[PDB]
């Protein structure tokens, strides 16, 4: 079981971190002042060129990945037997 349990834990670990991120930012004894803050709030009711430089960098690595995959497929022994 040990392998599938480690994969399941690594997948759920994001959900546990994300639910400590969105909490009232005080300890439970003192959270009542933040529920009062929430209750009165209920009663009242990357830049553009940095994104472009990022996505062009990603597209460079995508093109290198697909070329290296194609060169590894072409130099295999079964494909070379097909061409022979």
């Amino acid at each position: 079981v040990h392998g599938n349990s480690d994969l399941y834990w690594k997948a759920q670990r994001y959900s546990l971190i994300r639910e400590f991120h969105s909490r009232p930012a005080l300890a439970p004894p003192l959270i009542i002042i933040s529920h009062v803050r929430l209750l009165i709030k209920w009663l009242r009711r990357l830049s553009k060129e940095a994104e472009r430089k990022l996505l062009t960098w990603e597209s460079v690595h995508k093109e290198n990945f697909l070329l290296a995959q194609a060169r590894d497929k072409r130099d295999s022994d079964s494909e070379r037997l097909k061409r022979t």
């Binding site: 290198n64 070329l67 290296a68 194609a70 060169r71």
Partner: protein, 351 residues
């Protein structure tokens, strides 16, 4: 730094003004990656042009420079010559590492070379592009009025393919990596750009190959297709600067020079390839035979890997004086091109 590209190069209208068009040019709604761009004046110093290329834009040094000329067959070339342009030239430029100096317009030679570059990039995965560079006059550009705004490193959405008008303005081929648009302020003439082409290729043929130089001089070869009368005046302006040439078998002035090298009647030979101007162009034939060694023939020996060997034979024949310096240059160029298979079977046979 971005104003530095404008403060070095100037443009004349002849009232000379600092330039305003340095571009990271891209094409609208198309796959091709941003391309470099410059609008330039004529009679500029080619040293700062080259330092713009290898320091600012960023291109490696050439191991070979092959400029293609001609333009007789307008819309469609022979498929035999499309086999020559695709499987002879562009894959040799992919292997050795080379620049192709061709008119960056969509007419004549630059269209056919652009077909060969596109077809070779499709049917081959070598993880490296073919550096093709384009020179063209500023007056014939289709959308020259879009490229003004001097802000910096701007991708100008150059509208190719639009407003189809023929004969006057020509669009830019997207199969080129960098553009050198040479301006005379004429806006409609064909171009006195042949002087800048000869000065730039002479300056490239002065420099040395390698990391800190310390190598051989960069070989520059000229490839001709059928052409016109002004192409033969372009032959002579090339071969005065000690640049060898190479001839194809199709028709025109190229086959004119072939049959003239196979052997009054010569004036009759002049009276059917252009049908005009006998005695001035007969003096051009006289200067062709003053050189006699910077001209080679491709038609007798044709092949795929035969092309790079014919380039070497053109460089050996045009070397001239010393024999041992010629074989030294052939060995060090085989090292520079990173091709062991040439030097092992053509330089270490035993002769």
């Amino acid at each position: 730094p971005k104003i530095f590209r404008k403060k070095v190069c100037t443009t004349f209208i002849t009232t000379e003004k600092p330039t305003d068009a340095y571009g990271d040019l891209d094409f609208t709604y198309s796959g091709r990656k941003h391309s470099n761009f410059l609008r330039l004046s004529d009679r500029t110093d080619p040293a700062t042009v080259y330092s713009l290329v290898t320091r600012s834009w960023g291109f490696r040094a050439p191991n070979l420079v092959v400029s293609v000329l001609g333009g007789s067959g307008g819309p469609v070339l022979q498929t035999w010559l499309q086999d020559l342009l695709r499987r002879g030239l562009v894959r040799a430029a992919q292997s050795t590492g080379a620049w192709i100096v061709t008119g960056g317009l969509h007419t004549g030679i630059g269209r056919h070379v652009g077909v060969a570059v596109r077809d070779h990039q499709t049917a081959s995965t070598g993880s490296s592009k073919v550096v093709a560079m384009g020179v063209a006059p500023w007056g014939v550009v289709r959308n020259r009025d879009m490229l003004i705004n001097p802000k910096g490193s701007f991708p100008a959405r150059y509208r190719w393919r639009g407003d189809p008008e023929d004969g006057v303005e020509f669009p830019l081929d997207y199969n080129y990596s960098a553009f050198f648009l040479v301006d005379d302020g004429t806006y409609g003439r064909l171009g006195g750009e042949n002087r800048f082409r000869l000065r730039f290729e002479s300056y490239v043929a002065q420099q040395k190959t390698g990391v800190g130089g310390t190598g051989i001089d960069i070989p520059v070869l000229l490839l001709l297709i059928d052409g016109d009368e002004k192409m033969l005046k372009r032959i002579e302006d090339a071969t005065q600067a000690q640049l060898p040439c190479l001839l194809v078998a199709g028709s025109g002035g190229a086959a004119d020079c072939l049959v003239e090298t196979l052997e009054e009647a010569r004036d009759r030979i002049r009276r059917y390839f252009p049908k005009g101007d006998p005695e001035v162009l007969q003096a051009q034939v006289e200067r062709i035979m003053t050189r006699k060694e910077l001209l080679t023939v491709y038609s007798s020996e044709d092949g795929s890997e035969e092309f790079e060997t014919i380039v070497l034979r053109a460089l050996v024949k045009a070397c001239g004086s010393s024999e041992a310096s010629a074989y030294l240059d052939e060995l060090r160029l085989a090292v520079a091109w990173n091709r062991v298979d040439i030097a092992q079977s053509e330089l270490f046979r035993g002769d």
